[PDB]
PDB file of C-alpha atoms and ligand atoms in Angstrom:
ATOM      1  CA  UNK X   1     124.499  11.638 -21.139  1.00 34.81           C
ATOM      2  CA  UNK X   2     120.960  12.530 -22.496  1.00 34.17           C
ATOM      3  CA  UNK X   3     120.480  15.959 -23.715  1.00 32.52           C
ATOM      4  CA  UNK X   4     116.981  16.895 -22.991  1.00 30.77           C
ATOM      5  CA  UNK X   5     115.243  19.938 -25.268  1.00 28.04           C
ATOM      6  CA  UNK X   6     113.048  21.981 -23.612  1.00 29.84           C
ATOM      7  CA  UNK X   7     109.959  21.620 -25.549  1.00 28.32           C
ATOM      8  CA  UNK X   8     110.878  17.296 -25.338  1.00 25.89           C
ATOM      9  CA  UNK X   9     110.313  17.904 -21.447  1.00 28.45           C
ATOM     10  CA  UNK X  10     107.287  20.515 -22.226  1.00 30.04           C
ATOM     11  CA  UNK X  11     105.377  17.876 -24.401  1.00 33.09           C
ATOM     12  CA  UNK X  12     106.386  14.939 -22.124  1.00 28.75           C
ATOM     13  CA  UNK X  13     105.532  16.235 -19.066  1.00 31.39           C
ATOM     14  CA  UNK X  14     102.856  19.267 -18.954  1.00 31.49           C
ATOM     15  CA  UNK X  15     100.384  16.314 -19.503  1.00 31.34           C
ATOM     16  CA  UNK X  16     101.299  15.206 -15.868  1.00 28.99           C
ATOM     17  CA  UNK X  17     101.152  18.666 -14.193  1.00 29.75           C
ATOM     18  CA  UNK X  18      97.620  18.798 -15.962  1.00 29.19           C
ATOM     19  CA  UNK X  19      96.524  15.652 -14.331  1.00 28.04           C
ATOM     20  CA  UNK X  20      97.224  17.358 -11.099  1.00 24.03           C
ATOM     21  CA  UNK X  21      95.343  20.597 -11.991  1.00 22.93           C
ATOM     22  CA  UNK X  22      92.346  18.471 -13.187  1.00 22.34           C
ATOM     23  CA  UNK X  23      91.777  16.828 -10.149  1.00 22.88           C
ATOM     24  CA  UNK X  24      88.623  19.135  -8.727  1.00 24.03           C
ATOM     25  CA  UNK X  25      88.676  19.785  -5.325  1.00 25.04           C
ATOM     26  CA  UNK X  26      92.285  18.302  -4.695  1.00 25.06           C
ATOM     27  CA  UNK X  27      94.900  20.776  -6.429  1.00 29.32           C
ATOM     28  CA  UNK X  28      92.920  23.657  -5.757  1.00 28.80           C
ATOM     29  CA  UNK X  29      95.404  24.332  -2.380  1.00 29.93           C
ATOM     30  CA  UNK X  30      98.279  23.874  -4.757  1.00 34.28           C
ATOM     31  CA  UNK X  31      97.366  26.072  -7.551  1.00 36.01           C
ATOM     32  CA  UNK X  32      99.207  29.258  -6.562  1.00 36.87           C
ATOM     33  CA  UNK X  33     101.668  29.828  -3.959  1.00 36.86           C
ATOM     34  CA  UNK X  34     100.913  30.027  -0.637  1.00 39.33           C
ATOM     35  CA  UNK X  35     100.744  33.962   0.855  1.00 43.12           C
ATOM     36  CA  UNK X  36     100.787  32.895   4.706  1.00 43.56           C
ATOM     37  CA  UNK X  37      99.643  36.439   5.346  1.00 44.41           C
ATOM     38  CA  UNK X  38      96.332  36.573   3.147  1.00 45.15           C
ATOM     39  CA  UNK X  39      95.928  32.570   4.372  1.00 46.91           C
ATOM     40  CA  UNK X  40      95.981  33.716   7.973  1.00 45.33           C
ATOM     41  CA  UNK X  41      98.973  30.922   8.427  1.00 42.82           C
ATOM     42  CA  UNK X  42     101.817  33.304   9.396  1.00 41.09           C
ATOM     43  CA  UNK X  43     103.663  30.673  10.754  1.00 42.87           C
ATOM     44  CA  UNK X  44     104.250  28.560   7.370  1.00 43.03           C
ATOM     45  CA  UNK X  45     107.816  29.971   6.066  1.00 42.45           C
ATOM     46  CA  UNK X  46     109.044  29.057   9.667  1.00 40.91           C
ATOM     47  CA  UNK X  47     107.915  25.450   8.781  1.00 40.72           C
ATOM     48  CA  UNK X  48     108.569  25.334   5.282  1.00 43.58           C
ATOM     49  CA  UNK X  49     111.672  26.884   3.606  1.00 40.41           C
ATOM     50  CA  UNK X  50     111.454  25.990  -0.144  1.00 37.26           C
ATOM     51  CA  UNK X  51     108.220  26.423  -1.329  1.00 37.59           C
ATOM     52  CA  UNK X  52     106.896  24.862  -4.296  1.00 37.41           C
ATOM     53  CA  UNK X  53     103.730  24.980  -6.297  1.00 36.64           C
ATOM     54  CA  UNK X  54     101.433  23.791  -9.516  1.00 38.64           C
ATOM     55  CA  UNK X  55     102.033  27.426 -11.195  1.00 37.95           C
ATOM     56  CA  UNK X  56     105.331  27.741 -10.245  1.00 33.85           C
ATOM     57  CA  UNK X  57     106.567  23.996 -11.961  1.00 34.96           C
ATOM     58  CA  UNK X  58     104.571  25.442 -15.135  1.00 32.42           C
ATOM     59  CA  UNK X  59     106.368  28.523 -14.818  1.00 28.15           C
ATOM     60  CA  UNK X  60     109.521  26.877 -14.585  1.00 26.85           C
ATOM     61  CA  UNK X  61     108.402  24.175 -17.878  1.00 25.15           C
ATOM     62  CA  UNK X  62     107.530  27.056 -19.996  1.00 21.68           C
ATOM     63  CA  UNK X  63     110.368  28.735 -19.439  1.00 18.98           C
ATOM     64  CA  UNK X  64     112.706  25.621 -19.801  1.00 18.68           C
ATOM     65  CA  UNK X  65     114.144  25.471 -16.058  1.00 16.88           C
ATOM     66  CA  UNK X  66     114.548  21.853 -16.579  1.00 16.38           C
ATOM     67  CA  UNK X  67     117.395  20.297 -18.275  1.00 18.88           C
ATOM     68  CA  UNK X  68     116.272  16.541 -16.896  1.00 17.53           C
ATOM     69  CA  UNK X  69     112.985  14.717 -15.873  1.00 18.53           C
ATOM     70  CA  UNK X  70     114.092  13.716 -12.362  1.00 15.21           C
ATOM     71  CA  UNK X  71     114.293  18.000 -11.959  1.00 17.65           C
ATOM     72  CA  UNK X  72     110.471  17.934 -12.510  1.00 15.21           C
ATOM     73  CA  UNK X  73     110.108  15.338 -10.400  1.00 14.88           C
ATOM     74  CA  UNK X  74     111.844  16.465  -7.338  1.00 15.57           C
ATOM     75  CA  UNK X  75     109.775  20.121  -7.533  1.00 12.97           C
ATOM     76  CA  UNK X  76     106.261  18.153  -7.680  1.00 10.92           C
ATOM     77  CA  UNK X  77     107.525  15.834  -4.521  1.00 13.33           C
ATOM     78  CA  UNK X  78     108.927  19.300  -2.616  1.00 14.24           C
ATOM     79  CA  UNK X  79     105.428  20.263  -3.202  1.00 13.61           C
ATOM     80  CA  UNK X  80     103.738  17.549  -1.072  1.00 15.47           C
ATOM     81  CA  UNK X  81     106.414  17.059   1.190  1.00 11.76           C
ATOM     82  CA  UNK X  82     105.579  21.007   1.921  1.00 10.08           C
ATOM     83  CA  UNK X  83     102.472  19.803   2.747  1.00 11.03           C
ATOM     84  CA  UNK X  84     102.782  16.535   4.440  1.00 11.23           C
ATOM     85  CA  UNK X  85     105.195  18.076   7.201  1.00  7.13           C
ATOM     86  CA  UNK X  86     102.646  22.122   7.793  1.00  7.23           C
ATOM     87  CA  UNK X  87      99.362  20.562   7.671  1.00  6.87           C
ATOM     88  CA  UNK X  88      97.884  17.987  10.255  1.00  3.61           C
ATOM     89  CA  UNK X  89      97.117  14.482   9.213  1.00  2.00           C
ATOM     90  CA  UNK X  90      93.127  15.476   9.422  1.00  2.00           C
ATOM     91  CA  UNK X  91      93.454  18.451   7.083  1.00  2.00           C
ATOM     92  CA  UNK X  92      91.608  19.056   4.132  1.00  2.00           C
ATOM     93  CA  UNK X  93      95.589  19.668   2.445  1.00  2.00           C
ATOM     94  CA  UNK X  94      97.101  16.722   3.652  1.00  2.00           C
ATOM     95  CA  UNK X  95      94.524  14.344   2.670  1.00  2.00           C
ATOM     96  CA  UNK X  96      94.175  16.703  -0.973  1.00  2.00           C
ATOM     97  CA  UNK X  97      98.011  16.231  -1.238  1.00  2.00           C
ATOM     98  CA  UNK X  98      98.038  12.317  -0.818  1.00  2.43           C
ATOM     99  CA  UNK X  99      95.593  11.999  -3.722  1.00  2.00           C
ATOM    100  CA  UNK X 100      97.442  14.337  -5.961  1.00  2.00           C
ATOM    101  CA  UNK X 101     100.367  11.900  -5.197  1.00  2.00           C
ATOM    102  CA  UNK X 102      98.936   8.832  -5.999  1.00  2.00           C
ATOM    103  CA  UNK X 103      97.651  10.719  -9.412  1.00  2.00           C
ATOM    104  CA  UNK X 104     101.129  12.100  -9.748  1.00  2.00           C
ATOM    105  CA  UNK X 105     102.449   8.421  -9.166  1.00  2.00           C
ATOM    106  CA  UNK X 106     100.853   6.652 -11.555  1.00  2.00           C
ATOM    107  CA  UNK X 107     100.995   9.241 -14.766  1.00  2.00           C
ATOM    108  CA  UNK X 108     104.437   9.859 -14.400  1.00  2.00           C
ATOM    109  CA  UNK X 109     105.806   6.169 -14.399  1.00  2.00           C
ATOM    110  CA  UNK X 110     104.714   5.677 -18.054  1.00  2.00           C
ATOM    111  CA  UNK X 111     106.163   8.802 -19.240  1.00  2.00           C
ATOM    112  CA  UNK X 112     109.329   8.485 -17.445  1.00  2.00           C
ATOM    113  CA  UNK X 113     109.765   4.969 -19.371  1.00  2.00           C
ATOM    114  CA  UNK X 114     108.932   6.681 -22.686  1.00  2.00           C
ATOM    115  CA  UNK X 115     112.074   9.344 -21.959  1.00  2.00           C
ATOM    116  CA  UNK X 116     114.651   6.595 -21.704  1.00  2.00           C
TER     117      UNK X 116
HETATM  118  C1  LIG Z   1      99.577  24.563   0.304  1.00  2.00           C
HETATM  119  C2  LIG Z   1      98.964  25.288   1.525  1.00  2.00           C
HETATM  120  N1  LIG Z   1      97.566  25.566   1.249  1.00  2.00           N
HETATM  121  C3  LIG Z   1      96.762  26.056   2.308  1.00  2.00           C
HETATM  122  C4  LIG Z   1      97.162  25.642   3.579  1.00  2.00           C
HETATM  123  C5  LIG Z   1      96.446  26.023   4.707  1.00  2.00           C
HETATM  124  C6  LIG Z   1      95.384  26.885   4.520  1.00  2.00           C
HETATM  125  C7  LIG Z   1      94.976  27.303   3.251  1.00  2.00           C
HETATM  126  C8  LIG Z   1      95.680  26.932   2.086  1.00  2.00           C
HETATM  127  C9  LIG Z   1      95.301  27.359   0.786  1.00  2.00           C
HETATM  128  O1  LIG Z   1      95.862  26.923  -0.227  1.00  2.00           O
HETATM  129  N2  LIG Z   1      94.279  28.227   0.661  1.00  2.00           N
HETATM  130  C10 LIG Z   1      93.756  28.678  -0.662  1.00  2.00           C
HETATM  131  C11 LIG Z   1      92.760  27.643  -1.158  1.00  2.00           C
HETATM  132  C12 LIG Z   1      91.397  27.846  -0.443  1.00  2.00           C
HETATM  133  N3  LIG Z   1      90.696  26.549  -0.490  1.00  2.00           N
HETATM  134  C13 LIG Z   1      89.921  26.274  -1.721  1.00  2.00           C
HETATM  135  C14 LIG Z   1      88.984  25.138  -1.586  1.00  2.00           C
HETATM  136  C15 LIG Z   1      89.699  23.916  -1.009  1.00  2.00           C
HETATM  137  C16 LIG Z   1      90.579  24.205   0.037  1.00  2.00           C
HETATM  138  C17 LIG Z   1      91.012  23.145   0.841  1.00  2.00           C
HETATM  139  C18 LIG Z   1      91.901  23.323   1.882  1.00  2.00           C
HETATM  140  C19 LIG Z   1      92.380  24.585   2.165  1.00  2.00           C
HETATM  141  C20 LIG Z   1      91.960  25.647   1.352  1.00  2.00           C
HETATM  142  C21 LIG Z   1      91.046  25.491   0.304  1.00  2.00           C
HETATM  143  N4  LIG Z   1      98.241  24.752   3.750  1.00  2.00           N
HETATM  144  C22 LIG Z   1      99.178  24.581   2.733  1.00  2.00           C
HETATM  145  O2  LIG Z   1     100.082  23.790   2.933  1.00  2.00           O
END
């Protein structure tokens, strides 16, 4: 099996989370964790059990929480599910979190290739 270094994922795939932060007003839900208190959405850890979040998957790159790609990939997908299952279809999140998915989508393809 492939043994991944951590700073191999770090330069591989920080230039995909950056895509995400880059995209002005769409990641700007997604760049923090959610505090359902301060939000005034008390309800969301009822709805949503494993949160995820932009800072939190750099967090976990810098600090080499990854020991394969697909790892990365399933935190930034928990992250929209999150989002596609709270917030309505009309919402200014749901609708953020389908673009940052089709940006997501098509930057990580090419880099996945270039790790195998
Ligand atoms: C990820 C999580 N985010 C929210 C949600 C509801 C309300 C506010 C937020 C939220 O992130 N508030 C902080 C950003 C404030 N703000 C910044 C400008 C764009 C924007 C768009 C939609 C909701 C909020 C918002 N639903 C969620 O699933």
């Amino acid at each position: 099996k492939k043994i991944f270094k951590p700073e191999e994922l770090r330069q591989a795939l920080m230039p995909t989370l950056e895509a995400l932060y880059r995209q002005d007003p769409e990641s700007l839900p997604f760049r923090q964790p959610v505090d359902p208190q301060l939000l005034g959405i008390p309800d969301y850890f009822d709805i949503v059990k494993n949160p995820m979040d932009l800072s939190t998957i750099k967090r976990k790159l810098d600090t080499g929480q990854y020991q394969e790609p697909w790892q990365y990939v399933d935190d930034v997908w928990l992250m929209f599910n999150n989002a596609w299952l709270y917030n309505r279809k009309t919402s200014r999140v749901y609708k953020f979190c389908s673009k940052l998915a089709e940006v997501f989508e098509q930057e990580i393809d090419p880099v996945m290739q270039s790790l195998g």
